[PDB]
């Protein structure tokens, strides 16, 4: 099956195309998988056009007489990877012979998630509050913590984990660690995460799903 | 939650056979296909075999036929892949994948096999004679870490060849074979006959001759 392009540059943000011309009969539906470095295939697309559960919206499958694309609408870094076509029949797998997708390097900005403490710590006398930052590059970014809008200071420790690849990104986590008491006399906590001229701030209120 | 756990990879000779193991969770797998790919370093995926469920039915790819057999053991969740006849073409990460929509929706996490390739010429070394054994004297050569087999052995050129014995080569743990040439001569020749062991190895274009000198 051959695949068209074998290898393909691209940047963030941009639509991509990859065909197979199949070498088997159309009505055995093509199937598409992704494959990180060193890493199991990954189901993409099945019966040409169907979404496997939890794939992202941007991949989508289709067909044309004897020719199926796959198409990554807006390409996200986390989307290096080469991609393979399939056709099954009852005695014979094949695949097409894959398509690199190298994506050029630039800033990602980090999706943001904050996790007030559990019930059961506070029952220890601790409320650790978790700030993740996920998937960006490059590595510098400023996480500042308030509580009831009051900058905290020394009373934080981060964390830092790289995918160690060659489009890899930085994951990191800060952690706040507060008394039951101070954690129970106030009432909005927020982590602010400033890279170059963006600050995003993701908060909670205690007691307030 | 559904998981495929491989087991039984490694560094194997070619000619040789391996066992790769394929454990399911979450789902029994008497009532579905299950699948063995590979990939090659660098290269792309490849089917290998598949069997089929109640039946046993099996097929393979044409690369691999008559050298492994799929099989799988319901009361164990397990399948398997037994590799034979394995050849450097063979070295690849094996993956199992369970049969789904269409396609292959579980897969373990791969195994490597790797099938020993490198060329290595000879190391000779002297197994040197004294003297402590009446008027009898050994000597030698250890010929260590080549591949692949085989090399030959000669004495002087082919002029010595009374108590002569080559051994059989022995597979090292590492993948390399050696082996050790040894001679029984008179200790009073010791002095002045010189010895020299000949060693070729063809598939290196390597030729070691070695003088084995008292120490
Ligand atoms: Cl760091
Ligand atoms: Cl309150």
């Known amino acids: 099956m051959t695949q068209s392009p074998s290898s393909l540059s691209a940047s963030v943000g941009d639509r991509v195309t990859i065909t197979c011309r199949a070498s088997?009969?159309?009505?055995?539906?093509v199937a598409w998988y992704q494959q990180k470095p060193g890493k199991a295939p990954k189901l993409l697309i099945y019966?040409?056009?169907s979404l496997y559960s939890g794939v992202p919206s941007r991949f989508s499958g289709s067909r044309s007489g004897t020719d199926f694309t796959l198409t990554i609408s807006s390409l996200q870094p986390e989307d290096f990877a080469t991609y393979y076509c399939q056709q099954s029949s009852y005695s014979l797998i094949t695949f097409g012979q894959g398509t690199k997708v190298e994506i050029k390097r630039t800033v990602a900005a980090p999706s943001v998630f904050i996790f007030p403490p559990s019930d059961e710590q506070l029952k220890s006398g601790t409320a650790s509050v978790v700030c993740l930052l996920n998937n960006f590059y490059p590595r510098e970014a400023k996480v500042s913590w308030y509580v009831d809008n009051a900058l905290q200071s020394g009373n934080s420790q981060e964390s830092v984990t790289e995918q160690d690849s060659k489009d890899s990104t930085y994951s990191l986590s800060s952690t706040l660690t507060l008394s039951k008491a101070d954690y129970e006399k106030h009432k909005v906590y927020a982590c602010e995460v400033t890279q170059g001229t963006t600050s995003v701030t993701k908060s909670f209120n205690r007691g307030e799903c | 939650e559904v998981q495929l756990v491989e087991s039984g990879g490694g560094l194997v000779q070619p000619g040789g056979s391996l066992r790769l193991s394929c454990a399911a969770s979450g789902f029994n797998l008497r009532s579905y296909y299950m699948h063995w790919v590979r990939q090659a370093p660098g290269k792309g995926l490849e089917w290998v075999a598949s069997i089929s469920p109640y039946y046993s039915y099996t097929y393979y790819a044409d690369s691999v036929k008559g050298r492994f057999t799929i099989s799988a053991d319901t009361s164990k969740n397990t399948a398997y892949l037994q590799m034979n006849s394995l050849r450097a073409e063979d070295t690849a990460v094996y993956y199992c994948?369970?049969?789904?929509?269409?396609?292959?929706?579980?897969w373990g996490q791969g195994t490597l096999v790797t099938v020993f390739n490198q060329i290595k010429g000879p190391s000779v070394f002297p197994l040197a004679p004294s003297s402590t054994s009446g008027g009898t004297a050994a000597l030698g050569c250890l010929v260590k870490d080549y591949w692949p087999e085989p090399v030959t052995v000669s004495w002087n050129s082919g002029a010595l060849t009374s108590g002569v014995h080559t051994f059989p080569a022995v597979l090292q743990s590492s993948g390399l074979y050696s082996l050790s040439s040894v001679v029984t001569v008179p200790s009073s020749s010791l002095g002045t006959q010189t010895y020299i062991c000949n060693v070729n190895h063809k598939p290196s274009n390597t030729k070691v001759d070695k003088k084995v000198e008292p120490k």
């Open positions: 088997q009969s159309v009505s055995s539906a």
């Open positions: 019966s040409a056009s």
């Open positions: 994948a369970r049969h789904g929509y269409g396609a292959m929706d579980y």
